[PDB]
Amino acid sequence: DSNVVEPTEANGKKSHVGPHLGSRMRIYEYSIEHNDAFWAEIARRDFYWKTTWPDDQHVKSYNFDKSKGPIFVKWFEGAVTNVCYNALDRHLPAHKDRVCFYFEGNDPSVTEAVTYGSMYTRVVELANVLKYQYGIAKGDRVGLYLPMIPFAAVAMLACARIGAVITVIFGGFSAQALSSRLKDAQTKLLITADASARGTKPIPLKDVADEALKECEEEGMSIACLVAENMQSCKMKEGRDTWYGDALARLTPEQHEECPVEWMDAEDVLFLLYTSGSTGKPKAIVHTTAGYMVYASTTFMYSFDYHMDDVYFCTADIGWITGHSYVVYGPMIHCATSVLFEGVPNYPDYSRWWQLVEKYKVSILYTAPTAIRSLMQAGDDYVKVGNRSTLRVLGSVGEPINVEAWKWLRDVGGEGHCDVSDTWWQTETGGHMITPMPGCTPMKPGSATLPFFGVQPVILDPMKLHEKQGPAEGLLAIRAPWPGMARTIYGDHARFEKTYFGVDGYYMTGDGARRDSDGYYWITGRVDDVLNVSGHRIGTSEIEDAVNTHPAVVESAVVGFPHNIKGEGIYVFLTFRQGTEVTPELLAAVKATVRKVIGPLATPDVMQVARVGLPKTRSGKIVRRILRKVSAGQYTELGDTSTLANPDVVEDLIAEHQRLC
Numbered sequence: 001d002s003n004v005v006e007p008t009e010a011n012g013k014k015s016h017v018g019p020h021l022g023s024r025m026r027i028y029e030y031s032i033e034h035n036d037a038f039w040a041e042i043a044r045r046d047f048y049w050k051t052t053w054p055d056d057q058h059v060k061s062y063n064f065d066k067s068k069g070p071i072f073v074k075w076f077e078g079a080v081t082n083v084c085y086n087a088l089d090r091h092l093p094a095h096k097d098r099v100c101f102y103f104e105g106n107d108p109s110v111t112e113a114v115t116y117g118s119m120y121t122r123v124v125e126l127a128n129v130l131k132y133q134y135g136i137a138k139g140d141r142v143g144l145y146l147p148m149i150p151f152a153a154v155a156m157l158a159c160a161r162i163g164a165v166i167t168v169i170f171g172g173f174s175a176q177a178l179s180s181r182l183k184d185a186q187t188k189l190l191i192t193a194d195a196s197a198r199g200t201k202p203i204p205l206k207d208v209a210d211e212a213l214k215e216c217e218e219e220g221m222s223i224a225c226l227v228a229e230n231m232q233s234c235k236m237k238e239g240r241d242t243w244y245g246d247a248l249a250r251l252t253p254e255q256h257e258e259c260p261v262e263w264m265d266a267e268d269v270l271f272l273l274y275t276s277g278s279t280g281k282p283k284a285i286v287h288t289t290a291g292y293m294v295y296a297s298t299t300f301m302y303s304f305d306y307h308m309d310d311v312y313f314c315t316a317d318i319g320w321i322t323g324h325s326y327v328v329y330g331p332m333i334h335c336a337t338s339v340l341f342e343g344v345p346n347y348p349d350y351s352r353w354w355q356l357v358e359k360y361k362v363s364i365l366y367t368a369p370t371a372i373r374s375l376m377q378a379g380d381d382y383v384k385v386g387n388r389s390t391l392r393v394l395g396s397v398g399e400p401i402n403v404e405a406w407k408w409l410r411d412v413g414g415e416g417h418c419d420v421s422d423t424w425w426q427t428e429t430g431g432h433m434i435t436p437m438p439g440c441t442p443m444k445p446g447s448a449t450l451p452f453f454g455v456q457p458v459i460l461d462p463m464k465l466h467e468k469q470g471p472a473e474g475l476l477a478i479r480a481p482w483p484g485m486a487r488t489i490y491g492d493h494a495r496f497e498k499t500y501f502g503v504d505g506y507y508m509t510g511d512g513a514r515r516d517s518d519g520y521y522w523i524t525g526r527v528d529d530v531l532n533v534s535g536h537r538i539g540t541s542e543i544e545d546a547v548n549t550h551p552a553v554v555e556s557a558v559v560g561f562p563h564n565i566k567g568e569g570i571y572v573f574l575t576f577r578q579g580t581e582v583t584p585e586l587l588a589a590v591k592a593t594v595r596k597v598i599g600p601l602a603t604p605d606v607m608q609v610a611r612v613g614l615p616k617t618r619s620g621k622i623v624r625r626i627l628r629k630v631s632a633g634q635y636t637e638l639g640d641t642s643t644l645a646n647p648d649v650v651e652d653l654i655a656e657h658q659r660l661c
């Protein structure tokens with residue numbers, strides 16, 4: 001095809017796989033036909049095991065078919081390992097002087113090169129604080145509410161080292177959203193920081209944590225709080241709250257040097273990550289130890305073709321799966337040199353990421369289509385002042401990338417001497433599932449291209465629910481297990497089977513897709529009422545619930561709409577009680593309610609008042625198709641109105657939307 005972009009010659013010569021698609025397809029075919037041997041050989045080559053699994057030929061067991069029994073997946077069962085030891089200890093002493101993180105703060109005068117040796121010291125100190133001052137035991141839950149600073153990685157690895165289970169709460173979440181997660185995960189300890197800064201905006205962290213802990217205490221939980229000094233005179237509750245500096249001082253000197261490793265079974269839980277579904281409140285996706293460890297690290301190495309002479313920079317936050325797999329765990333297990341950045345691409349100005357690229361000789365950069373589009377809007381002058389000669393791989397994650405942004409990323413940001421890895425995956429898959437690999441994969445802008453090693457995607461007919469062969473469009477599903485797959489939903493396996501295994505034999509992704517005549521996949525987006533807003537998965541029912549907590553609100557309906565920067569924006573239709581004085585202030589207060597309940601990531605982009613009411617059937621069900629079409633200006637595609645109790649409303653909905661948009 002004419003839209004194919006060939007991999008660069010230089011990347012082809014460097015590739016772990018090889019210089020042409022045949023090289024990839026050789027390994028892929030083996031990884032499907034000899035799936036157990038493939039993963040056993042990868043596992044043996046790339047990771048330390050205290051104890052190996054008993055049989056290379058059977059490293060997985062599973063059931064994808066509800067009629068046979070409960071759904072389950074296990075990998076490397078019988079093996080013993082530790083994630084911290086693989087990310088940190090095994091790299092010493094040879095690499096003690098290698099940089100692990102080139103850290104930069106929001107303020108560009110705040111910088112630190114943190115070596116693997118220094119990370120070991122930091123992690124050993126914290127692990128001992130958790131063990132001997134908090135009595136954190138194997139399997140206990142620990143919450144993290146942290147900015148993108150070295151201590152965030154340190155805390156994730158320390159918890160891994162002692163077998164604690166982390167649940168990371170994105171620093172953008174509100175106090176109520178943090179509290180809900182702490183309660184549901186039953187965390188014994190919260191680790192946070194005094195505060196951070198994003199651009200000119202203060203990011204309170206401990207002050208937010210204070211309200212959240214107060215909420216948890218009103219519900220009878222007892223949660224201790226350990227606070228890192230990032231910027232302060234934060235309110236510290238006596239007996240509950242400790243400064244990390246005061247904890248460090250209570251360590252004996254040899255506890256700055258040694259902390260024993262908890263040796264973990266393969267299916268021991270590593271972390272819980274709360275994720276939005278189509279219904280109900282967000283639920284925690286459960287990842288265990290060995291299979292996730294293997295999958296996240298192996299995708300890191302191949303999807304980005306990471307070598308030891310590469311310098312890697314992922315712009316994603318630890319509050320999301322991308323920062324778990326591709327900021328902390330994956331990169332450090334392969335002993336990568338990474339850039340860790342606390343701030344934003346536009347502070348001090350829009351050259352900031354390019355200043356980081358040139359300063360640290362970044363060769364692999366992993367970011368999001370929404371960020372690329374904002375840089376595009378900002379103007380190319382902010383890119384072209386920077387030396388980009390070291391870049392050779394650029395990655396895109398979290399939402400579909402339009403052809404214009406792809407081309408701009410590669411030919412402006414990467415100066416035309418870069419391969420682009422558009423990686424499709426989700427929280428539930430642990431790691432990349434469909435992705436280009438640099439040097440060996442011809443690229444089609446906008447396509448994730450081919451399945452990762454060991455992955456068998458399919459297109460299911462939305463009607464017949466069987467596999468469709470050849471070029472086809474339908475539901476994207478995976479027909480076989482891979483080591484990184486989530487093992488359950490915390491406390492709700494029933495919902496897990498319902499959500500992902502409604503079609504016996506398959507993992508249902510929740511995404512739509514088209515596979516073309518070359519076998520390349522094109523992901524079309526969620527097929528359920530889940531939005532991807534600036535790359536962030538968020539459920540429409542959660543936003544409606546938050547909107548409806550305002551006392552003036554009678555009812556709301558939330559839909560996504562196309563957005564030229566964010567990919568998808570948040571559109572709110574709502575009705576107020578009779579007599580309400582509707583002003584921009586009131587609308588702003590309803591937005592603030594959403595931001596208090598959830599956080600700024602859920603901020604409504606458009607608020608439309610249904611002066612006559614929402615379109616509902618005679619049974620009271622809101623007809624969401626009308627609202628989706630109206631919010632997108634697709635006035636001609638509204639569809640059926642014959643089941644509306646109130647067909648009079650349709651004219652107003654269009655009229656008002658035209659007024660606004």
Ligand SMILES: Nc1ncnc2c1ncn2[C@@H]1O[C@H](COP(=O)(O)O)[C@@H](O)[C@H]1O
Binds near residue numbers: 532
């Ligand atoms: N490369 C991509 N192309 C298209 N959609 C993506 C891509 N990566 C992530 N997504 C979307 O993001 C969802 C997962 O969000 P999360 O679980 O938060 O990582 C997927 O189900 C997709 O809808």
Ligand SMILES: [Cl-]
Binds near residue numbers: 259260261
């Ligand atoms: Cl040990």
Ligand SMILES: [Cl-]
Binds near residue numbers: 306307308309
């Ligand atoms: Cl290497």
Ligand SMILES: [K+]
Binds near residue numbers: 536
């Ligand atoms: K996403």
